[PDB]
Design an enzyme around this catalytic site. Structure first.
Site, short mmCIF file in Angstrom:
data_model
loop_
_atom_site.label_atom_id
_atom_site.label_comp_id
_atom_site.label_asym_id
_atom_site.label_seq_id
_atom_site.Cartn_x
_atom_site.Cartn_y
_atom_site.Cartn_z
CE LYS A 15 -2.14 -1.26 3.83
NZ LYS A 15 -1.57 0.04 4.30
CG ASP A 35 -0.67 2.16 10.67
OD1 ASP A 35 -0.13 1.36 9.87
OD2 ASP A 35 -1.47 1.80 11.57
NE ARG A 126 5.90 -3.51 7.84
CZ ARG A 126 4.59 -3.29 7.98
NH1 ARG A 126 3.74 -4.31 7.96
NH2 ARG A 126 4.14 -2.05 8.15
CG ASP A 165 1.60 -33.98 4.28
OD1 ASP A 165 2.56 -33.56 4.97
OD2 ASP A 165 1.66 -34.08 3.03
CA LIG Z 1 4.50 -32.20 5.18
#
Ligand SMILES: [Ca+2]
Ligand SMILES: Nc1ncnc2c1ncn2[C@@H]1O[C@H](COP(=O)(O)OP(=O)(O)O)[C@@H](O)[C@H]1O
Ligand SMILES: Nc1ncnc2c1ncn2[C@@H]1O[C@H](COP(=O)(O)OP(=O)(O)O)[C@@H](O)[C@H]1O
Ligand SMILES: Nc1ncnc2c1ncn2[C@@H]1O[C@H](COP(=O)(O)OP(=O)(O)O)[C@@H](O)[C@H]1O
Ligand SMILES: Nc1ncnc2c1ncn2[C@@H]1O[C@H](COP(=O)(O)OP(=O)(O)O)[C@@H](O)[C@H]1O
Ligand SMILES: [Ca+2]
Ligand SMILES: [Ca+2]
Ligand SMILES: [Ca+2]
Lengths: 289, 289, 289, 289
Positions: A15, A35, A126, A165
């Site tokens: 942004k 902000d 950040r 998985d």
């Molecule tokens: Ca995995």
């Protein structure tokens, strides 16, 4: 007609880098941002942690519209203004359109859709102005809702099922089975659940496009003994994020033949995905890779 | 005898803030640090991301000892040196003691043991020089090993069992049951597992020290129907982190009567704890609070 | 009655460090600031150099009063607001008092008078948000006018004169005379000017309070041959800045017996002083010490 | 033969931005730097002010050569090292060439000659790691000596003279004469000095290339009455810094016909120039423009 540009993005999306970039080249526009107001009225120093207040917010919002009207009611040199906020709450986006309605200004949008994984990468770095992980997730969740992305609500008809998985879930890294989890699949086997197996490993290599699919299928089926019903894996040659691969496999191969009621994984970026699209998920181990 | 102080801590523990603080008041000591060498030899700018190399490391290590010997072989004004690194790898700590051995210097330690949760808080806000979450976890894991903290290896004899949390695990927030999970406890009931229930809710209030323990016990037992065997909860008046409470309850009430083979939770800081002490754990939902 | 606090100071004086400090302890006040607005509306990044505009200023001013009225017309919890600007222009200070007049608010002042020399020290290290040296000088000049400090306008009656420093002016560092300058004093001798000599050297030491005054007087008078009329020097035991010493000597020993028309020096901090109080001054050499 | 690159520049010249830039593209080189060592051994934080010590310096130097030899005596992958210091002291540059001599390495140079004015601009905005103005001047002075730039030592034969600027020196801004200074020129007229007048004003405009030269000559000669002997001014169409213009005019029109013994100016960047080339100069007023 003068314009009011709303940027739509989660923090770290781009942004601001854009707003400055833009304004520099388009003399006539001006930046308005929460902000900044939030920090100025507390005289905070970059390294300070602002404390949330319903009172201070009102103030900040007031500062926005007032400055909006105030900069949009100036010389014929004013092209318009940019609201470099997250603008992810809709009730808020509406508020702007209505406001610009009763003054004669149009509302434009500039989207900054960045993958979850990339947002997380930047957020962590950040620093002070970083945002908690739980608020980033919600932000992004609102961004998906604004983009229209799908959320699985189920599948009436087809049999219910749990997804598993392989790397790090059923297997621990010719690896060895992860006891408690393999037992799980077999317990959901009793109950009366269909067990779909999934894997982000490339199916195979250039010349042997199934070398790994085969090696996996063997393992799952003859060492883990998982009574699966369907096995899916990343097609050879796919260099897209695990994130993206398993979603695509879900929508194009799973969702339309099963009523998914749970997914088991270990990789955070994948678990984070299952939950966004509306699929319960249990992370069986720390998987920050 | 001149000294060589090794700081022992995960990044963000306080090592450096201390080193500068110290050196300022104790004229005679000098700081030596890997991070600094790692950045200088790449002429990196604060916002740059150093790339790991076995070659560059050797270089950096060499720079340390050389400077060590070089500053410790100076004027009788040199009190000693501080190695403000993580120093969490033992093979490395040993290396120093041996080195200081064949030169006539003693090795001292300055520990900076900070709770996991606090390390994570600072890390995220470290910004550029922040460290990936997976490396922080390992670091801390090595710190626990250096402090001697316990790691549960099991319990020969007593019956095996799975632990379940209440808020956000069995219950979703007079809340309503979380289907898939409550079923789990009941499935581990079939198999032949003992089910211990746990909760971080205060048992009760000042005057009614069990108000919540009772309200919970009722719920679990009459709405969720969890066939538990033992229920434990945070004693009224305990304002310590959930992190710490459940570990204490595990060691003093669970570990000595059960062979824990799994723990179910949702709160990240708690799941992170179960795994450090050597207890498999499945996070059933995003819990970054 | 709600209050509006105006901080009065040059950049680096302490305004902001104070505002944050204050607000933190006095929940009820809120900060309003030009610099912040100036950066936000350009979406500038800390390292950017804002470009001055009469248009952008108007905007910024508007943002101030609007926010002022807007935060002062809120809940009975609002104690008031702080304007952490330089507020050194009077027409501007007046503007506030009038504004707070037609709304029912009082205007208070919080001064941050810091020595020139200290302002310069901090400015240079302000980095990006530092301010050009010529604007700092003007700022401070306005601060002196606000404090009422004196500005020498001359002395009707007494004879005109030129002031000369010794270290680095008449002498170059038992040093040796600085040719061109010593000639100057002698040329202003022809014309018909009285020559007052001045020096920041301590007159002498603890036990010999004139050791240096004497050594100087000798030198000036017998090696430089400066036809002075009055010699003044820093009294033994004075550890105040050269800045301050020579001003005091000017007002208490020179100004009332001479019509000063010029001062010769080399030390920047001193030359800077002569000019503030309204006395022409020529720096004969780079003197940044 | 492995190389050792010495960067030659004043702080802010570009040394480091280049070193990182270079190293990034030329995998094989490594950066060595005093500033880094100076901060690391004190565990200083970016905003700290290092205190100079002969002891700490030795340490730092030792750290350099040791690391130099240590990184240059490694794998055949090491192309060489960069010494991103100011390297302006010659005794130091020699030290490197000798050192690289008795080890088999060659010494290369990478110059970063930036105008004084530009160095000053950046320095002020360097912030903490900024450098005092008096040390920058010396640095640059050493850089001029390394580049071979000229220093006027006088002119045997031709008559002695004093140079005067017009804007802000003889005139205060059809402006009005600056009393004390105009008197000066006339006093140096008595003595027996030739008076050369100089001006940075463009001689004239596109179509009237002497419009201002004429307007000035008139003024000087008929309102100030300066008994000049030669007048020089910036030729029409010259957009180079005042800095550079007056030096060129000095060397090509003044130095070869006069024995300059003084220069009078007000503009800092110009006064700074007169003194570098070896010409005494008196600043008659604050001129930071
Ligand atoms: Ca995995
Ligand atoms: C870069 O990126 C960060 C902000 O990036 P950007 O995504 O463009 O804005 P925003 O803060 O609105 O998310 C800053 O630290 C800046 O210096
Ligand atoms: C504060 O804390 C951070 C470093 O803290 P500290 O824990 O003391 O050192 P380390 O970087 O070795 O972990 C810096 O950003 C500093 O400005
Ligand atoms: C310290 O001092 C600087 C600002 O100081 P201060 O004088 O209090 O405010 P102001 O910027 O209004 O002059 C900042 O760099 C801060 O981090
Ligand atoms: C830019 O320029 C500054 C240093 O610039 P550079 O001249 O290249 O190096 P050096 O510090 O050696 O003078 C830093 O603040 C950097 O972020
Ligand atoms: Ca919980
Ligand atoms: Ca002096
Ligand atoms: Ca001038």
């Amino acid at each position: 007609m003068k314009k009011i540009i709303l940027t739509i993005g989660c923090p770290g999306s781009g942004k601001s880098t854009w707003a400055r970039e833009f304004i520099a080249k388009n003399p006539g526009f001006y930046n308005i941002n929460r902000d900044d107001y939030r920090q100025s009225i507390m005289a905070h120093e970059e390294r300070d942690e602002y404390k949330y207040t319903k009172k201070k917010e009102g103030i900040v919002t007031g500062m926005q519209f007032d400055t909006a009207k105030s900069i949009l009611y100036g010389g014929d040199s004013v092209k318009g203004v940019i609201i470099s906020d997250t603008n992810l709450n809709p009730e808020r986006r509406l508020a702007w359109e209505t406001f610009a309605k009763e003054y004669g200004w149009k509302v434009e949008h500039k989207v900054f859709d960045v993958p979850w994984t990339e947002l997380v990468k930047r957020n962590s770095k950040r620093g002070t102005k970083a945002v908690p992980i739980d608020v980033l997730r919600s932000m992004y969740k609102s961004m998906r809702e604004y983009l229209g992305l799908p959320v699985y609500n189920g599948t009436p008809g087809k049999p219910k099922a749990v997804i598993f998985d392989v790397d790090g879930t059923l297997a621990k890294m010719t690896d060895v089975i992860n006891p408690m989890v393999v037992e799980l699949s077999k317990m959901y086997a009793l109950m009366g659940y269909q067990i779909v197996v999934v894997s982000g490993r490339e199916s195979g290599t250039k010349e042997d496009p199934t070398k790994y699919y085969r090696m996996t299928r063997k393992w799952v089926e003859d060492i883990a003994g998982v009574p699966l019903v369907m096995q899916c894996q990343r097609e050879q040659g796919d260099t897209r994020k695990d994130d993206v691969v398993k979603e695509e496999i879900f929508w194009k191969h799973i969702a339309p033949h099963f009523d998914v009621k749970l997914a088991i994984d270990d990789r955070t970026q994948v678990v984070e995905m299952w939950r966004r699209i509306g699929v319960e998920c249990w992370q069986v181990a720390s998987g920050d890779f």
